Amino acid sequence: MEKKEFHIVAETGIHARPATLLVQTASKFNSDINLEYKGKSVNLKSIMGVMSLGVGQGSDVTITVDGADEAEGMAAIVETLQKEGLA
């Protein structure tokens, strides 16, 4: 299991295209991937879950990756957050 904290700085927060690309990336892995904000956790492979969380600019979030491809899954997520300018 891998866990990492991130501070969201995009003006859009996790919404619109930045949110869809993130979920698409998460969806490529077999591990369980969860996003947690202010104590509530959602499946990062679910666009509905992510939208329900309502993560805006300045938010502190935690991502947990747990499974057979968790090393490359966490790495890919870190890469994607930085490439999209989310965190």
Cα gap 25→75, rounded to integer Å: 11
Tell me the chain's radius of gyration from C-alpha atoms.
11
What helix, strand, coil percent values describe the chain, rounded to 5?
35, 25, 35
- Among 6, 12, 15, 21, the active-site one is 15
Q: Which fold has domain 1-87?
A: Histidine-containing Protein; Chain: A; (3.30.1340)
Structure's resolution in angstroms: 1.6
Q: Give, as one character, the DSSP assignment of residue 59.
A: -
- The residue behind tokens 């104590």 is 39
Q: Hey, which residues does 2 pair with through a beta bridge?
A: 65
Residues in contact with 29: Cβ distance below 8 Å, sequence separation at least 6, in sequence order: 65, 67, 69, 70, 72, 73, 76
**Active-site residue, 7 included:** no
Sheet holding 60-66, edge to edge: 2-7, 60-66, 32-37, 40-43
Scanning the chain, the segments in alpha helix (DSSP H) are 16-26, 47-53, 70-83
List the one residue out of 12, 3, 2, 4 whose CA is nearest residue 50. 12
Cα gap 74→79, rounded to integer Å: 9
